[PDB]
Design a protein around this ligand. Structure first.
Ligand SMILES: [Ca+2]
Ligand SMILES: [Ca+2]
Ligand SMILES: [Ca+2]
Ligand SMILES: [Ca+2]
Ligand SMILES: [Cl-]
Ligand code: NA
Lengths: 148, 19
């Protein structure tokens, strides 16, 4: 379970701000799309609108901070749950080909606000890459994400 | 280790659930 502590609220605000690039306190479909596109995805307007509709209690077409937190309360689970690890793999695997490359990892990490140095990227890939193909598949990813 | 800690940071602020 997550708590509404000052520290946690600040973390959620950081996430909200990633989307709310104009700082107007609302996340639009345009803003959702810009972030997803930065991760190699190209969702339809329908897909973007559906995400808003999940928590758009006032029906104004955008997500405000309370609605965003309602989404987090509904969706968020343990960091090592099966569904969070599969969803994390899909995000890092920009092209959906079943392997996370160094280029993908670097791109996704910086566009989500946690830029890695090339040394941090190479280190993560090297250590997670058990089969030696230079990339990280789902099974390797699970191992990396669960190993303590 | 450090890259993994950063991934955990992204998870705990909900960015995997959003993306
Ligand atoms: Ca906005
Ligand atoms: Ca709304
Ligand atoms: Ca890939
Ligand atoms: Ca591999
Ligand atoms: Cl507190
Ligand atoms: Na405090």
């Amino acid at each position: 379970a997550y708590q509404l502590t000052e520290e946690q609220i600040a973390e959620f605000k950081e996430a909200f701000s990633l989307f709310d690039k104009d700082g107007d306190g609302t996340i639009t479909t345009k803003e959702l799309g810009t972030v997803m596109r930065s991760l190699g995805q190209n969702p339809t307007e329908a897909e973007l609108q559906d995400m808003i509709n999940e928590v758009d209690a006032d029906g104004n077409g955008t997500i405000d901070f309370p609605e965003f937190l309602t989404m987090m309360a509904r969706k968020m689970k343990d960091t090592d749950s099966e569904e969070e690890i599969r969803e994390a793999f899909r995000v890092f695997d920009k092209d959906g080909n079943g392997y996370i490359s160094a280029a993908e990892l670097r791109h996704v990490m910086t566009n989500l606000g946690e830029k890695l140095t090339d040394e941090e990227v190479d280190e993560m890939i090297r250590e997670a890459d058990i089969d030696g193909d230079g990339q990280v598949n789902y099974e390797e990813f699970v191992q990396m994400m669960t190993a303590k | 280790n450090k890259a993994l800690k950063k991934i955990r940071k992204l998870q705990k602020r909900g960015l995997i659930q959003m993306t």
